[PDB]
Amino acid sequence: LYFQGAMALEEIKNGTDISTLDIRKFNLNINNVSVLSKSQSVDQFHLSNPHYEYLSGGAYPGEMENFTLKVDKSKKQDQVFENPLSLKFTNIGTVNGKQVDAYLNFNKVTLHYLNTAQAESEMNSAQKSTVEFFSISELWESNAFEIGNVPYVDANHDYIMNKAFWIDADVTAEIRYADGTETDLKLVMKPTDIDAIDANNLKETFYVKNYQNDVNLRLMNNANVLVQEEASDRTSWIATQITGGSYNENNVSGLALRSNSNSMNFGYSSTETCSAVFGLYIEKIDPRPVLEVDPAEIPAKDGQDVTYKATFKVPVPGKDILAAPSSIEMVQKFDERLDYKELKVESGGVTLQEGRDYTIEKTGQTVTVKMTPEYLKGNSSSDIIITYKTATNKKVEESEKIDNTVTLHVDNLSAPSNQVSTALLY
Ligand code: NA
């Protein structure tokens, strides 16, 4: 059942329109990327309005940072490039008041020799020297990077081989709070347009390593026609049909993945000539919970009432978050100098009931409200308001202020409220 899957990977296929999600796409571009390290195998260069695939090919407007791999032209056989490229995107957004950075590490890129005349010919030509694997641009989508073996070229960079090798890129993306605090963000990727199949039946493939342990939720639209291949070390999604237009690229040949963590070790393998475009995302809990405290200041002494009111906005399934919540919890932790007394929970002008609508777990100063499966089934959209009654205790006079924050949990997602404080007088 939907509400008793603790730990279990949750896979969903439903009518949600993946092309119209309202999730947050992080800012990733040629202007906030830096190369933390790259091996000498990597040929990196800037292009402006590059040509697609061939020099005589169409030219597309935009700045791009392009990355290729120098191959050993004598080895007409698979070539492996360990850790060729490690990237940081500095300040991809502000979330919950904190700067977030992205890390993108190419763990390995393997070039699989195509064993054709065309491949041998590129290998033997004196003008070709590198193979395409990665680029950063907004030619296709905003805030995106591109993995694939389709060359981008201009008059001075026409050395990239065509259809000599297909590529398999093993990549780890991670999002991280710059300030060093624990990153509670759950990375989301949304591969789309996984639809290329070449003359030789190679198929465009997106994959996730350690899928079963690393992914929290996987969303498909009813129209999905990818083949999901579950193997020991990974799960892959394999092209089966051409798809055009954002709706089809998203729903027919696409999917959404929410990680168990701030990172995901994914992969991508091309055909003799294809590529895919990617952003990094998170779901939205916006607004954050709104926390209030009455009063703003008290006499520093035992038995003084302090009351917290927390207003929780519930994310909208299929817009802010990928799907209806399996669980919603609100976690409060009171300053040592406070004794918890009791709480009430309200929604839609009505006073919800402990037992029917929510339960309460207390462990020391930590008090958690858990909404029941019965409440969640009602798919209510209205704010949940929790009012916590506490009173100072005999420890108040031991920080000349008592601070409070409450945290909303939706599945494995969380968002902290604003912090409030009550001044201690004397
Ligand atoms: Na397509």
Author numbering: -6 to 0, 36 to 426, 429 to 456
According to the publication:
The Sgo0707 protein consists of 1643 amino acids including a leader peptide, an N-terminal region, eight 84-amino acid repeat domains, five 88-amino acid repeat domains and a C-terminal domain containing the LPXTG sorting motif. Based on their related domain organization, our hypothesis was that the N-terminal region of Sgo0707 also represents an adhesive domain. Interestingly, binding to type-1 collagen was significantly reduced in the mutant strain. These data suggest that Sgo0707 plays a role in initial adherence of S. gordonii to type-1 collagen. Interactions between the wild-type strain and collagen-coated surfaces could be competitively inhibited using a recombinant polypeptide encompassing residues 36–458 of Sgo0707, suggesting that binding is mediated via the N-terminal region.
The structure of S. gordonii Sgo0707N was solved to a resolution of 2.4 Å by single anomalous dispersion using one crystal of SeMet substituted protein belonging to the I222 space group with four molecules in the asymmetric unit. The initial model was subsequently refined against native data to 2.1 Å resolution. The structure can be divided into two domains, N1 and N2, which both adopt β-sandwich folds with antiparallel β-sheets. The N1-domain is the largest domain (residues 36–311) harbouring a putative binding cleft which strengthens the original hypothesis of the N-terminal, non-repetitive domain, functioning as an adhesin. The pocket exhibits a predominantly negative surface potential formed by Glu81, Glu169, Glu174, Glu232, Asp221, Asp223, Glu277, Glu300 together with the polar residues Thr220, Asn278 Ser274, Ser303 and Cys302. In all four chains positive electron density is found in the cleft but this is more pronounced in chains A and D. Although the protein was crystallized without the addition of metal ions positive electron density, indicating a partly occupied metal ion was observed in association with Asp221 (OD1), Asp223 (OD2) and Thr271 (O) of the A-chain. Interestingly, the 1643 amino acid long protein contains only one cysteine, Cys302, and that single residue is located in the floor of the putative binding cleft in the N1-domain. To our surprise we found that the N1-domain, despite very low sequence similarity, exhibits a striking structural similarity to the variable domains of the AgI/II adhesins, also expressed by oral streptococci. Whereas the Sgo0707 cleft is predominantly negatively charged the AgI/II clefts are less charged and have a tightly bound metal ion. No isopeptide bonds are however observed in the Sgo0707 N2-domain and the residues in the equivalent lysine-asparagine positions are Leu319 and Asn434.
